[PDB]
């Protein structure tokens, strides 16, 4: 009964630990000793985008590398043109408590969500010349923490109730559900080829999910506190986590264990966001000490600092062509670096 | 040339700069309380108008917004506590049911001792005030707290004991004033009390931003 199953679970955990131990024949901290350092990286602000009336909580770059969308605590979305700094759209929401954004790959729709347990989908191309709500998805129990499009027809969301869901937009019903976490889920990230995804959920644990089959495949552990950010390495077989104990880490999906940790003794504050550069050589991280750090992914050293915001950096993103960086903070400004 | 994009952007800025004036007058108050604290009756007797509920009203030409978190408040997570722009927190706590005081105390010392609410003052409404009087004249308050010193059948002693027991839970008392009141079914002066406490909070803030101490 219960005791035999528990014993078998313990035996399998011992097997997993032994299999992970037996594969550690080398490390990046030694193999990467033949890599020339990237040197000192220096960046300057090109544009400053003004107009939000409160804290900024999310952003997402478009797929043409020119338009972007952001959401604020006063309950608004703004769609910006960044080459000229012109505002293209300003969308007012139904409730001021918003926490996430997404921008569709084709450019026809956007989405948002928050403490109302509902995900709203807006249509940007109508014959009447306005923006109207196309769909409202309801059925979650906790608040909404992240949302990412797959195409014009399907979406995937994560909640603060230990669940994730894949939805078909046309009918509005949950096509599949993913369960297994114990605490609230903070963030998820999609694969480049759009077949799998990863999520981190306040257990200091991360899980890898298959979209269509609907089960968890791998589980990674090692942090000491909540995981607040996650993203994929460009070729889709690695990912990086940022947590609330002032530490980032790198995981590989095939070796099933950790490779490097990124942390320095002068940081005593947690992470808010991570992202990679186009070739995978730089890792950008945002902190609660008002600055952003640019790390060398392979040697685990500090290559640069971005400073100029006066409050916490909460949002951070890199374009699809790789020619700019955008940061958003609690002082209600967006900045573009290049 | 197609530079009408710039003119369109200027038109959008003309509306943002209009709403910026209204977003600097509104006063936000976060409402908390127990399950049996008469919360529904308290709010429904003020003549005002599931995720989050919001209520709007006006006192002396000042707009007040009351934000009610209906049972989602049990979350012990920092990211859920994104209510740090509020002017004050308003607790409704019962005192007539002597077996429910420990729960309210444990809720209170859990909320007040949090960091994120260091810049917000706190108001405390001891509720119904009369079933407590009936209990005192029939039963003694020593049967639950073996810490009271005084007359078990005097209402004043009970009131001071409860108020001091609540005030003893907080630390760093001087950060922001803590007010308390006794209300039964008044419903008509509650606006006066909340207005006065918020006004005193703003006055203390001004005495400090102007470098007067």
């Amino acid at each position: 009964e219960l005791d035999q199953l528990r014993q078998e679970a313990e035996q399998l955990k011992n097997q997993i630990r032994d299999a992970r131990k037996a594969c550690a024949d080398a490390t990046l901290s030694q193999i990467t000793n033949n890599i020339d350092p990237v040197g000192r990286i220096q960046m300057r602000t090109r544009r400053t985008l003004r107009g939000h009336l409160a804290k900024i909580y999310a952003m997402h770059w478009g797929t043409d590398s020119r338009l972007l969308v952001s959401a604020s605590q006063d309950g608004k979305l703004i769609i910006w043109d960044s080459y000229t700094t012109n505002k293209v759209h300003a969308i007012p929401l139904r409730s001021s408590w918003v926490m996430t954004c997404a921008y569709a790959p084709s450019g026809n729709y956007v989405a948002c969500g928050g403490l109302d347990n509902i995900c709203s989908i807006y249509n940007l191309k109508t014959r009447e010349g306005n923006v109207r709500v196309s769909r409202e998805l309801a059925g979650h129990t906790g608040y909404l923490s992240c949302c990412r499009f797959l195409d014009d027809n399907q979406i995937v969301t994560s909640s603060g109730d230990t669940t994730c869901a894949l939805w078909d937009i046309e009918t509005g019903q949950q096509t599949t559900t993913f369960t297994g976490h114990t605490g609230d889920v903070m963030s998820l990230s999609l694969a480049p080829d759009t077949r799998l995804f990863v999520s981190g959920a306040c257990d200091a644990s991360a899980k890898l999910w298959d979209v269509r089959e609907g089960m968890c495949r791998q589980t990674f552990t090692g942090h000491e506190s909540d995981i607040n950010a996650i993203c994929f390495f460009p070729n889709g077989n690695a990912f990086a986590t940022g947590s609330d104990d002032a530490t980032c880490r790198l995981f590989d999906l095939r070796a099933d264990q950790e490779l490097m940790t990124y942390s320095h003794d002068n940081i005593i504050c947690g992470i808010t966001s991570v992202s990679f550069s186009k070739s995978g050589r730089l890792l950008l991280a945002g902190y609660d000490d008002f600055n952003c750090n640019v790390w060398d992914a392979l040697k685990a050293d500090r290559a640069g600092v971005l400073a100029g915001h006066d409050n916490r950096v909460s949002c951070l993103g890199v374009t699809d062509d790789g020619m700019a960086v955008a940061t958003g903070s609690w002082d209600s400004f967006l900045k573009i670096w290049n | 040339e197609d530079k009408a994009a710039a003119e369109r952007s200027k038109e959008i800025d003309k509306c943002l700069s209009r709403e910026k004036t209204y977003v600097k007058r509104l006063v936000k108050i976060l409402l908390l309380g127990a399950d049996n604290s008469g919360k529904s009756t308290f709010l429904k007797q003020m003549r005002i108008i599931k995720g989050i509920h919001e209520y709007d009203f006006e006192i002396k030409n000042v707009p007040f917004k009351m934000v009610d978190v209906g049972g989602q408040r049990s979350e012990r997570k920092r990211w859920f506590e994104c209510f740090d722009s509020v002017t004050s927190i308003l607790f409704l706590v019962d005192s007539s049911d002597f077996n429910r005081l420990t729960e309210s105390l444990n809720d209170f010392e859990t909320i007040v001792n949090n960091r994120v609410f260091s810049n917000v003052s706190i108001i405390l409404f001891l509720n119904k005030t009369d079933l407590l009087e009936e209990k005192v004249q029939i039963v003694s308050i020593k049967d639950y707290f073996l810490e009271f010193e005084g007359d078990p059948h005097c209402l004043r002693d009970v009131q001071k004991f409860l108020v001091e027991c609540f005030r003893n839970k907080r630390r760093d008392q001087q950060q922001k004033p803590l007010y308390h009141h006794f209300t039964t079914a008044i419903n008509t002066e509650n606006a006066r009390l909340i207005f006065r406490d918020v006004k005193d909070t703003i006055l203390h803030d001004n005495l400090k931003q102007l470098m007067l101490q």
Partner: single-chain antibody, 232 residues
Framework: VQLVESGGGLVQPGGSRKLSCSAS????????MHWVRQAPEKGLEWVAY????????YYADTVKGRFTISRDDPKNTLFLQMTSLRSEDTAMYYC??????????????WGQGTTLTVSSADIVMTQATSSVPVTPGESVSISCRSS???????????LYWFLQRPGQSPQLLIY???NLASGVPDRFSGSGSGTAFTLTISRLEAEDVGVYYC?????????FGAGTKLEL
């Protein structure tokens, strides 16, 4: 979406007239509006422009000081007040819709127009021909030329192609020299380079005959071409 015009008829030399236009089915206060004109047996000619928020107003060279454009948003109405009429003002007048932001499609809906009868450093655009006999199932091309280069330093080429069928208002085919409009079948194409542009129609079908026009939108005033007719 619908735009309906009123105010036409017969007028004596001198005198005055007022034309009005009523819009229904869209957000009138977010669009800019044009008044365009067509002589009885000639091509199209542009008359006036009013912007959103009533900030900018433009007139043609041969109408300044006599014509006035105005709009009313809480009733969705547009007015053209016109005075001191000559015999050269006899024409059919259309009202046109246009919205400008990054990636939009101007000139994409025309009204039905009204008839009014009365008792240079500009860019020049030239059509190749006045008529081209065609047969169904063929592939045909049209071309037009300009006196300047329409390519700007930001990467856009401002050439527009419209088609007018017998008895109907014009319709947008191509905007900014390469792009298709909504609802236009993908058998139309257009390309070229500075000072030489060509439109290609593949597999001609019925109800695809009429007159074709090319227009520029680089600087005001906006000017039209002479017109190419296809006969089946």
């Amino acid at each position: 979406v619908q735009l309906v015009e009123s105010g036409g008829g017969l007028v004596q030399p001198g005198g005055s007239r007022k034309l009005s236009c009523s819009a229904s089915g869209f957000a009138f206060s977010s669009f800019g509006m044009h008044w365009v004109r067509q002589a009885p047996e000639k091509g199209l000619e542009w008359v006036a422009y009013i912007s959103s928020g009533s900030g900018t107003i433009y007139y043609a060279d041969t109408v300044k000081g006599r014509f006035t454009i105005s709009r009313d948003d809480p009733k969705n109405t547009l007015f053209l007040q016109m005075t001191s009429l000559r015999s050269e003002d006899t024409a059919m007048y259309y009202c046109v819709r246009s919205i400008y932001y990054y990636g939009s499609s101007p000139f994409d809906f025309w009204g039905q127009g009204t008839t009014l009868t009365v008792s240079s450093a500009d860019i020049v655009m030239t059509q190749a021909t006045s008529s081209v006999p065609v047969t169904p199932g063929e592939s045909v091309s049209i071309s037009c030329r300009s006196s300047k280069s329409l390519l700007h330093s930001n990467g856009n080429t401002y050439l527009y192609w419209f088609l007018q069928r017998p008895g109907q208002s014009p319709q947008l085919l191509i905007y900014r020299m390469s792009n298709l409009a909504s609802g236009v079948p993908d058998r139309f194409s257009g390309s070229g380079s500075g000072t030489a542009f060509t439109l290609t129609i593949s597999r001609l079908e019925a109800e695809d005959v009429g007159v074709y026009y090319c227009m520029q939108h680089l600087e005001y005033p906006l000017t039209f071409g002479a017109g190419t007719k296809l006969e089946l």
